[PDB]
Amino acid sequence: FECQFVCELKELAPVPALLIRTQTTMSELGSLFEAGYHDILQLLAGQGKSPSGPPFARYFGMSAGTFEVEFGFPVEGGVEGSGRVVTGLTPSGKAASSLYIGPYGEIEAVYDALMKWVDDNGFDLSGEAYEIYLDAPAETAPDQLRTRVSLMLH
Ligand X SMILES: CN(C)c1ccc2c(-c3ccccc3C(=O)O)c3ccc(=[N+](C)C)cc-3oc2c1
Site for ligand X in 64-103 (CB under 6 A): none
Q: Which is nearer to ligand X, 30 or 127 (CB)?
A: 30
Residue 130 makes contact with ligand X by CB under 6 A: no
Which neighbouring-strand residues pair with 88?
Answer: 17
Q: Measured from the CB atom, is 68 or 135 closer to ligand X? A: 135
Task: Give least dist CB 55 to ligand X, A.
Answer: 5
DSSP-assigned beta bridge partners for residue 7: none
Around Cβ 109, how many Cβ atoms within 10 Å?
Answer: 13
For residue 117, state whether it binds ligand X (rule: CB under 6 A). no
Q: Which of 134, 18, 31, 149 is nearest to 96 (CA)?
A: 149
Evaluate whether 90 touches 74 at the Cβ level (below 8 Å): yes
- Which of 60, 67, 123, 135 is close enough to bind ligand X by CB under 6 A? 135
Q: Does 108 bind ligand X (CB under 6 A)?
A: no
Site residue total, ligand X (CB under 6 A): 15
Pick the binder of ligand X from 3, 19, 24, 37 (CB under 6 A).
37
Terminal Cα distance for the chain, rounded: 24
Cβ neighbours of 92 (radius 10 Å): 12
Query: Interface with ligand X by CB under 6 A: which range of 8-16, 20-28, 31-39, 112-120?
Result: 31-39
Say how far apart CA 2 and CA 98 lie, in whole Å. 10
By CB under 6 A, which span of 1-9, 11-19, 90-98, 128-136 interacts with ligand X? 128-136
Q: Which amino acid is at 103?
A: P
Name the residue among 2, 20, 9, 32 with its Cα closest to residue 121.
9
Q: Using the rule CB under 6 A, is 154 a contact of ligand X?
A: no
Residue 56 interacts with ligand X (CB under 6 A): yes or no? no
Q: Which residues bind ligand X (CB under 6 A)?
A: 30, 33-34, 37-38, 54-55, 104, 133-139
